[PDB]
């Protein structure tokens, strides 16, 4: 948690909002860690219902995706093939220990 700036920001939310956002964040990370060779898992459409309603309006949520290794484009957030899965796992754990 507090060891990460983005996670520390995410922690400033109320309990229900934190749990909802963190659950979705762990879902995205786990999909990649479960199959690092699947490109669908490496892209999140910004207009997607879950993203636009559970992360976009939440303090620190999108910042956590950035620390994981995702980068923002015009329509999607993308986790590059060059990105470190070790860094991804690191942020994933720092979020999980705060739930």
Swiss-Prot record:
Disulfide bonds: none annotated. It is found in: Cytoplasm. Residues 20-81 form the PUB domain. The PUB domain mediates the interaction with VCP. In case of infection by cytomegaloviruses, it is not essential for degradation of MHC class I heavy chains. Specifically deglycosylates the denatured form of N-linked glycoproteins in the cytoplasm and assists their proteasome-mediated degradation. Cleaves the beta-aspartyl-glucosamine (GlcNAc) of the glycan and the amide side chain of Asn, converting Asn to Asp. Prefers proteins containing high-mannose over those bearing complex type oligosaccharides. Can recognize misfolded proteins in the endoplasmic reticulum that are exported to the cytosol to be destroyed and deglycosylate them, while it has no activity toward native proteins. Belongs to the transglutaminase-like superfamily. PNGase family. This is Peptide-N(4)-(N-acetyl-beta-glucosaminyl)asparagine amidase. It comes from Homo sapiens (Human). The lineage of its organism: Eukaryota, Metazoa, Chordata, Craniata, Vertebrata. The chain holds residues 11 to 109 of 654 of the full protein.
């Amino acid at each position: 948690g507090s060891a990460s700036p983005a996670v520390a920001e995410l922690c400033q939310n109320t309990p229900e909002t934190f749990l909802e956002a963190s659950k979705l964040l762990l879902t995205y990370a786990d999909a990649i860690l479960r199959n690092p060779n699947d490109e669908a898992a490496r892209s999140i459409r910004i207009g997607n219902t879950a993203f636009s309603t559970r992360l976009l309006p939440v303090r620190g949520a999108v910042e956590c995706l950035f620390e994981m290794g995702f980068e923002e484009g015009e329509t999607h957030l993308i986790f590059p093939k060059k990105a470190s899965v070790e860094q991804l796992q690191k942020i994933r754990d720092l979020i999980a220990i705060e739930r």
